[PDB]
Amino acid sequence: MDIISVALKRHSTKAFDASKKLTPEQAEQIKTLLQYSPSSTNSQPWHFIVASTEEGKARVAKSAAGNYVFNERKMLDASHVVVFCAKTAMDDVWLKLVVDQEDADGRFATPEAKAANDKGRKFFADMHRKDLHDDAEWMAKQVYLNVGNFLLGVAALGLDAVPIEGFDAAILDAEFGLKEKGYTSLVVVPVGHHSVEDFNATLPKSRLPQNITLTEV
Amino acid sequence: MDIISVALKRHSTKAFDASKKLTPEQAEQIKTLLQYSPSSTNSQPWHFIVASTEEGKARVAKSAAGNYVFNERKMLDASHVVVFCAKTAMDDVWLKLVVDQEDADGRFATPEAKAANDKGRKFFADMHRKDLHDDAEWMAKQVYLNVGNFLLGVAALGLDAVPIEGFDAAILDAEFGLKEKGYTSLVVVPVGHHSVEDFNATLPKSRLPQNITLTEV
Ligand SMILES: Cc1cc2nc3c(=O)[nH]c(=O)nc-3n(C[C@H](O)[C@H](O)[C@H](O)COP(=O)(O)O)c2cc1C
Ligand SMILES: Cc1cc2nc3c(=O)[nH]c(=O)nc-3n(C[C@H](O)[C@H](O)[C@H](O)COP(=O)(O)O)c2cc1C
């Protein structure tokens, strides 16, 4: 509405209404938000698993079977459950896939502009995978940027969601065969409509005062 | 005009118009955006620096040195410049500051409900802090989540912005004494209004197809 109005009214939902499914239109919009999120050098080091079926959702809920049981209902009652994944290593095949896609979309006027752009991405990529040896952590951050974009995007659509770190990535990666494919699960985000059992919806929002976290100059 | 339109039309502005400044209401709005962002266990492991004066922006612009001289113009021409910083380590006092804030906000019905939220947080904290030994990374991921929330947010307000990783953190940290305060600059986001020289405002948007990044189940 006010994007500040949605920012202030949104909340991580604790209980979902199993009966409230997303319309095919919202299911499409939600996917658009996942795809069009920005990332450093437009590297898009990610993969998304959108579960809509009960068998699919239950497959995801398998990762919270351990000591994260209090999270299962959340992944089952929600309409769609999206698991954000990040690349395990930045490879040359992925970088070529990006600039070639940028070229296909008409972003370069000459072949030199494309070369310069590829060289520029390589500068950052090599800085992480060659020098600092932190390319995996680098890419993981880009996915979290996407989740942040996503959580605000859904709230603005009028949908309820909750980010979940409380799940076993080892089991999740195993169940979907990810990272044989070069990926690792990071965040599981259930999307749908909240029920009445969600007490968090009627509680006041809480954040530290700006005089603690903000410095103006 | 819904958010999908907002996400499709926004772009990483390459050139800023120094004459077009943020309105006073817009200044308080981007601050509200920064603070009201979600984060794992509401840990809010962050600090921000909002530079709006010539003196402040030049101080940040110092980080745009050596190999990053190409980003100096963006930091000086943008109306406001936000430096997203993350805590260098999770200390018990900060965990206490968070719990007591939620309490003063009325999020707890009983004192036993407040303690349960504390141990719930400490659980995740000690997980990264003690076990995994990756709390610095964990907290930075929450800061990248704020950037994703912030980027979509300012775009929704009608502003132009650009995430910048290309800058020397060691210079920026030292210029603001962040180091001794337990923080580290990670992302710089100049916000304002793009100028006619911003070629990125007219080029087509490019993202990989969903048949590569998305898997439905
Ligand atoms: C990355 C991330 C992970 C989270 N994981 C969980 C979780 O496992 N379970 C849960 O109930 N809430 C989880 N949350 C919700 C946060 O605690 C919530 O953002 C915080 O309490 C602030 O409340 P709000 O989101 O309503 O503004 C998570 C949030 C984030 C950003
Ligand atoms: C974390 C991050 C860092 C970025 N760093 C820079 C930068 O240093 N300079 C720049 O001009 N663009 C930078 N970008 C912009 C990206 O190249 C841009 O997000 C990508 O090309 C997609 O274009 P769009 O944001 O216009 O959709 C960055 C983006 C992100 C998310």
CA of B61 to the centre of ligand 1 (A): 34
Total structural domains within chain B: 1
Nearest to A118 by CA among A97, A138, A87: A97
A14 is catalytic: yes
Q: How many CB atoms lie within 10 A of CB A19?
A: 10
CA of A38 to the centre of ligand 2 (A): 7
- Show the tokens assigned to A68: 């994260």
Tell me whether strands B80-87 and B160-161 are parallel, antiparallel or unpaired: unpaired
Q: How many CB atoms lie within 10 A of CB A80?
A: 23
Nearest to B163 by CA among A38, A150, A34, A135: A38
Nearest to B98 by CA among B87, B181, B16: B87
3-state secondary structure of A79: coil
β-partners of residue B47 are: B85
**CATH code (residue B10):** 3.40.109.10
Side-chain-side CA neighbours of A199 within 13 Å: the count stands at: 3
- Show the tokens assigned to B146: 């704020």
CA distance linking residue A72 with residue A51, whole number of Å: 14
Nearest to A193 by CA among A2, A14, A7: A14
- Who contacts B168 (Cβ-Cβ below 8 Å, separation ≥6)? B63, B64, B65, B66, B68
Query: CB–CB of A102/A42 below 8 Å?
Result: yes
β-partners of residue B16 are: B194
- Regarding the beta carbon of B42 and ligand 2, being less than 6 Å apart is answered no
The shares of helix, strand and coil residues in chain B, as percent rounded to the nearest 5, are 55, 15, 30
3-state secondary structure of B2: coil
3-state secondary structure of A66: coil
3-state secondary structure of A49: strand
B69 contacts in chain A (CB < 8 Å): none
CA of A13 to the centre of ligand 1 (A): 9
A216 contacts in chain B (CB < 8 Å): 49-52, 56
Nearest to B21 by CA among B156, B192, B197, B196: B192
**Chain B closest CA to A141's CA: distance in Å?**
5
Candidates B145, B157, B187, partner chain A, best to mutate (most A CBs within 10 A): B145
A179 is catalytic: no
Give the residue from chain B lying closest to A187, CA to CA: B40
Query: CB–CB of A56/A109 below 8 Å?
Result: no
Residue linked to tokens 């409230």: A20
Nearest to A47 by CA among A156, A172, A154: A172
Please tell me which residue in A57, A62, A72, A74 is annotated as part of the active site: A74
CA distance linking residue A76 with residue B38, whole number of Å: 23
Query: CB–CB of B81/B114 below 8 Å?
Result: no
State the method.
Answer: X-ray
Candidates A47, A183, A213, partner chain B, best to mutate (most B CBs within 10 A): A213
Starting at the earlier edge strand, list the strands of the sheet with B80-87.
A214-216, B46-51, B80-87, B183-192, B160-161
Helix (H) or strand (E) holding B216, with range, is strand B214-216
Nearest to A76 by CA among A17, A150, A153: A17
The shares of helix, strand and coil residues in chain A, as percent rounded to the nearest 5, are 55, 15, 35
Query: CB–CB of B185/B5 below 8 Å?
Result: no
Domain of residue B196: give its range. 1-217
Helices (H), chain B: 3-9, 24-35, 54-61, 72-77, 92-104, 111-126, 135-157, 169-175, 210-213
Query: CB–CB of B193/B160 below 8 Å?
Result: yes
CA torsion, points B106, B111, B117, B119, in degrees to nearest 10? 150
From the list B47, B208, B212, the residue facing A213 with the nearest CB is B47
- CA A122 to chain centroid: 24
- Show the tokens assigned to A112: 């030199």
Tell me whether strands A183-192 and A160-161 are parallel, antiparallel or unpaired: antiparallel
CA distance linking residue A75 with residue A60, whole number of Å: 7
- Show the tokens assigned to A79: 């309409």
B7/A153 Cβ within 8 A: yes
Radius of gyration of chain A (CA): 19
Each as own residue / partner, the long-range contacts of residues B100-107 (CB below 8 Å, 24 or more positions apart, any chain) are B101/A206, B101/A207, B101/A208, B101/A209, B102/A206, B102/B42, B105/A204, B105/A205, B105/A206, B106/A203, B106/A204, B107/A203, B107/A204, B107/A206
